Paper text:
The flavin‐independent enzymes, named Mfr (Gehl et al., 2023), was currently identified only in mycobacteria as a monomeric enzyme. Recently, we reported the crystal structure of Mfr from Mycolicibacterium hassiacum (hMfr) and provided evidence that Glu9 in the active site is the key catalytic residue for 5‐iminium cation formation. Thus, the mechanism of eMTHFR and hMfr is basically identical. Position A contains a glutamate residue in all three reductases. In hMfr and jMer, apparent k cat of the equivalent Glu9Gln and Glu6Gln variants decreased from 594 to 1.3 min−1 (0.2%) (Gehl et al., 2023), and from 18,200 to 71 min−1 (0.4%), respectively. Neither variant showed a significant increase in the apparent K m for their respective C1 carrier, suggesting that glutamate and glutamine bind in a related manner. In addition, we obtained the crystal structures of the inactive variants jMer_E6Q, and hMfr_E9Q to exclude perturbations of the active sites. X‐ray structure analysis of the jMer_E6Q and hMfr_E9Q variants were performed and the structures were compared with the wild‐type enzyme, which confirmed unchanged active site architectures compared with the wild‐type enzymes.
Author numbering: 2 to 124, 129 to 297
Amino acid sequence: TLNTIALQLVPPNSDGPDGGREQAVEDARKVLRCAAETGLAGRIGHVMIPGMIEEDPDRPIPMKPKMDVLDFWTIIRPELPGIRGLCTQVTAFLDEPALRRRLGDLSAAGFDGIAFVGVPRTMGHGVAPTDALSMFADLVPNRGAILIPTRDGEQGRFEFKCERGATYGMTQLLYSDAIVGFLREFARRTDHRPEILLSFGFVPKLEAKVGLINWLIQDPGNPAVAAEQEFVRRLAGLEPADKRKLMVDLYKRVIDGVADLGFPLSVHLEATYGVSVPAFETFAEMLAYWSP
């Protein structure tokens, strides 16, 4: 079990002559600075590096190439003394031998958890993500499945992934208490008690203009998600202290709602638009209420 506070850090664009290395160092230093400014120095235990970024097909200008997960960690690891690694990893291009090689490399580099994921919709000889969960379990021994508590059929989908060896579930961004009802029914139906990495994403006013979070959580026809998107739209437009209050209230509703269910809990902090002092001001008040 991780019992950790994880901060998501997206690898920089690698299309420059430095391959993103200067940007990676500055990003790490911005993390330390923002944590220090908000009373969170030394509190973040892990960085969550995604090894997959879904691309919105309707965005006019394309994503640039991104730094490899392990290249990125190698650069930022010296700048974040004491912080360890978590990641997601695409397994579609990793046969069983190559999956053991990648796992050994990530373990040796200091990664403690790995969530196996699929390929973006707009992009094949390896293991399916759910088959990888139980392989070479001594390497990076925290093995993550993605958990979206609003998604149709998620009770049977996530139960199966626990059967196949998931030790933790990394949630989609949480903008309602749907995870409370989900885990209450999961605990009732099953004996599985994976660690839950509860994901919380700061919403700046830029979301009102860009709508990236709204798109990241979209599920057309799902009324529970519609409610979440309405919550995100509301937050985007509220004044800074108002959106902090509402996000902290949501945090408290989730933590209280799941605290007696028997799942180990970690916290996954996300700033989709980039780390900032306002994001960390919100994180700090959340973690002041409850921290793993």
